[PDB]
Amino acid sequence: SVSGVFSKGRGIGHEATTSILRYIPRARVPWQPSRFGRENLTAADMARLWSRGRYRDGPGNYNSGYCTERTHVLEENTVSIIPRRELEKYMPDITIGPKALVTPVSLMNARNGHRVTHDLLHSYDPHIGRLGKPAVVDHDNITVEDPNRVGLNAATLDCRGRIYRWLRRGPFFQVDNYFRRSVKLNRDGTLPTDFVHEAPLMRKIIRLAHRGHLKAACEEYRRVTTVPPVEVYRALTACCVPGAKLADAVSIFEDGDSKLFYVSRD
Amino acid sequence: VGYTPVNPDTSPMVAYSQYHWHYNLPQGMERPHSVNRTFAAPFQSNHSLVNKYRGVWIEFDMHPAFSVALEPQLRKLPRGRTLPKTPAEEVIADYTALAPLVDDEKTRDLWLAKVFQHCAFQRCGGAMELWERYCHQRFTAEGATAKPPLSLVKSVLFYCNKTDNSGWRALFDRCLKDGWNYTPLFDTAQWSFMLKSIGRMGDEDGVRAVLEEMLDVQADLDRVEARSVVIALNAVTNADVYEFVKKYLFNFGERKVKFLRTTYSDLRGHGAGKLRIPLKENDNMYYHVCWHSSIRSPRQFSPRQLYFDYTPSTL
Amino acid sequence: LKIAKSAFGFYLARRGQRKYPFLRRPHIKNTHSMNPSAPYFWSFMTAKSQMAFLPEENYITGDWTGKFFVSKRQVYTLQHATSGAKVRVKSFPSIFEFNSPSRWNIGKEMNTLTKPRMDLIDEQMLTKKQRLDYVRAGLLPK
Amino acid sequence: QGAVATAEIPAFFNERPAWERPPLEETLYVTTNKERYDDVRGGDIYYDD
Amino acid sequence: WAKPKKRPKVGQGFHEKAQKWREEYLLDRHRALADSLRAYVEFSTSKRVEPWDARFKPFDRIEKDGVYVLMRYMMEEKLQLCNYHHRPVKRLFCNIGLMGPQITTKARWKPYRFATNPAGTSKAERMYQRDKTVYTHGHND
RNA sequence: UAUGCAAAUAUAAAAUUAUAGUAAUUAUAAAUUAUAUUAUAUUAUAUUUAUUCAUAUAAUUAAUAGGAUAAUAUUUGUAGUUUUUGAUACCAUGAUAAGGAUUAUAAAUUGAAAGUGUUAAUAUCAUAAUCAAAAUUUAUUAUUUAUAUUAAAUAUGUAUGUGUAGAUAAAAUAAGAAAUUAAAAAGGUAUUGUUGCCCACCAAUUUUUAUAAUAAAAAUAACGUGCAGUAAUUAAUAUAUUUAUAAAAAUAUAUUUUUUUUUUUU
Ligand SMILES: O=c1ccn([C@@H]2O[C@H](COP(=O)(O)OP(=O)(O)OP(=O)(O)O)[C@@H](O)[C@H]2O)c(=O)[nH]1
Ligand SMILES: [Mg+2]
Ligand SMILES: [Mg+2]
Ligand SMILES: [Mg+2]
Ligand SMILES: [Mg+2]
Ligand SMILES: [Mg+2]
Ligand SMILES: [Mg+2]
Ligand SMILES: [Mg+2]
Ligand SMILES: [Mg+2]
């Protein structure tokens, strides 16, 4: 007498809060009190639901190549899959691996706000790709499988309000959220300014500004992903002094003010 | 007519009907609207402010004479928004060496405040001696009249808060009305750190004193960070202080209260890792927090859940 | 549609014999894809330049468990013959297989080596009426 | 007569002149505009209590 | 709008029948293609009838005079080299320039399918006598 | 085709049927039902050009969350599974098409309401939806016909046969066509009316009796044959004689409860 879609489900948040919390009545949606969302799905069920819902390229469909079934039936005729190792013999294998799915931050405005070339859209906001936890995008680890479930899936359960949410986004959404989720003032009162991976760049900018190449230094300034230290701006404006260029000095300082946390107020 | 409602802006048959303006009438503006002028709403972002200092500002007033002279020693200390990584032992050794050479009370004390701050950031425990070695004699000992520079007080207090310490209770008490009266001049950050440390070491009575003081001095309650208030109210197991904390819990705002419940529920929850020292289980307090929250927020009507068991009587 | 040959037979109307703008018909069915040309052999239904690279489908793009049929636009390569591996294409009823390798295939698409409309007609998929009509056309014997 | 157009405008444009209505109504009369609970077959569904 | 009637099942052993039919259809298509390429190149190399129409001028004129003179002594080697295919014939006549502007305007050439007949063709029936088993697009002898 | 026999509508009567006990009535006439060659109320159909007509596929529709030049919220990172069932492949009302037949020329339109897949109250079998490169059977479609002929998304290999069967298509509008015709007279056993009603035989039964192949008469709702009747597919009605699966049919007379066609000495 009981027909369900899934056999079992799980809770969003754990014992410490729940065991006490249950004593306070929560107001459920009046028309549809019982909520079963995609955050309530189990491991298997979620895996399956994230496979389906992407037309061809998506892992769920059988000929996408990510199919783990060893046999598939086309109209009463059973077909046995060809293993990839054998598929390689007549069809050369070119795989760059993960890194070819990610463009640098530079291109992001050209790409309309994305670093990610994957099948699903990837939002840099917390709430669209949110499962139980807030979504975070690994720029190293991106796979076709998408373990973290951060991508925007077209057909999955509960996708609708998310898709709407995406189409409702502000003009700078992608860019702004990428910028604020990373790059924030330290709990100490210390600037984010010092980061290992970007340091040689800042060294190059300063060293270039000191020999008086302003344009070169700026062309490298463009490539900077993180807030540059005060020394950078000191070097750039000090380079700006001899040739009398005022406008460029002012725009430098104006770039450091209120945009970048006032690194340039010094 | 359908399951899709006519959107009344686009549809002429709405627009041009007798209950709205037809196109042959003269198309002017009907009535003016001043909304933003009559009642104005103050700005509170749902996101916290981006550029705020977020720490304790130690107020460096030094004369621009010694501030040149002491530069080689000072450079190792914190300036504005800059936190040099120099080992604490070295800085304390420098002050211990040179400071008696300089004659000013103000300069030496400002210097010392900076030393305390620098040590509070690295959490070195051997700083407190500098309080007992120089300052204790003229400020906290045996009713000495001298009144300490505010920078110094704030700095030492922040040190006691960062490095968990009992000594704070003697300083705090000196700063009330009858004493130095530095209490109204504290940053919101100061109160946050204070409540956090105090809640960690687990003094219900320290907490009650401090909240009393904050309420009286008109600190900014809702802008006191949630983490610290939750930790502080977590440590409270005593019946009287518990009563005080209900009655005090009403002193917050609607939003603040909801995110107190949320912060609390995250902190013994998934976000248990967010803390350096894990919390201690307080069930009654956490519960009463979620209860206060459920009370102050607006009520939604869920008739099926309320009246689920109801039955009519012909009595 | 009259008979539902697929899912879409429920959704779609034929709308008589109806004209579409040039070279846009909703459902691409290339009946002409295999259409013998000796002189035009390299220019017909193939790459507009000989200097172009092979399509996406001549290469393994990612880590694959494996596939059932390779897409029909994948060009036949000398290795397709030599390696002696399964080469499958999705045609109707089920799948077409390159079984009997030849060098005359090389450098054309299997879009071109697979006859879309076969002269072999099963009578088991036909209604009695349909069989009658095909008899009218002088296709089926009777 | 019947309605050609309808617009929401403040009531101080047309409201019964000060000498027609009873004296200060804000102070001496407690008035709530409310809806009839019963089904009304004709007339207005909002009455002034 | 009638509810579409469902399509009957596929059939049995039909998958093998179809695999087989297409397979050997291709193995046949190989000899089709080979034969047709032979026929095409063979056509390309072999001689053809004269592409011009002798019913108009500058061609009707006696083969001892006018254009033909220009053809015999100056152009002959070139015309015989390209086997009188109408495209290079017309192009050579363009490049000889001693006719110059007239090649397209005044002069007149046999229609495509007639100009394609083998040298020594007598009767028009020769258009429909060419092999029909070969795919050259009327480009075979 | 009036030498045998042979009274018989031209009205003396008291509700229909029925041999004078059967059923509860019957009969009836003018409402209503689109085409029968009328004068030009003021102008024309008898010209032109056409006809080889095909195309659909690889399943998850359920919610809100704001960031630089803003007087300070980590609200950085906002975490309470699980009691409902229709638009589905499936029964599940509505609503807009196509379709030339008599309001005309002046300051002027040659496209109509009578409903053609997708739309709003009947629920109780199922995920069937394009994001490429794909499988002809469907009444409802104007294709290039002999000087020169495949380069950018991939783009149609088949049918030369005396402009040739039957049968079909379009047009009187910035084009060019010119004289043959059409308006007025009509019936209903039905009663939103011909997809209407009825007629006999052919079984059971019910009931009265004046028992003739097989009694008669009256109620009656099966089955099977037809198609008798409503000017009704050779008009009907009455008598007469004949004929016979069944209504009925043939002939002889009278007759309209049938519709009309009309020379005041040519
Ligand atoms: O409200 C917040 C949010 C985040 N954090 C972040 O959590 C880390 C550890 O969280 P804790 O808040 O437990 O460490 P702490 O009190 O010793 O840190 P201080 O305030 O003394 O610096 C902190 O060092 C900071 O990175 C907070 O301290 N408070
Ligand atoms: Mg779908
Ligand atoms: Mg309809
Ligand atoms: Mg009897
Ligand atoms: Mg009887
Ligand atoms: Mg009769
Ligand atoms: Mg009859
Ligand atoms: Mg009759
Ligand atoms: Mg009769």
Ligand SMILES: [Mg+2]
């Ligand atoms: Mg008779």
Ligand SMILES: [Mg+2]
């Ligand atoms: Mg009879």
Ligand SMILES: [Mg+2]
């Ligand atoms: Mg009779």
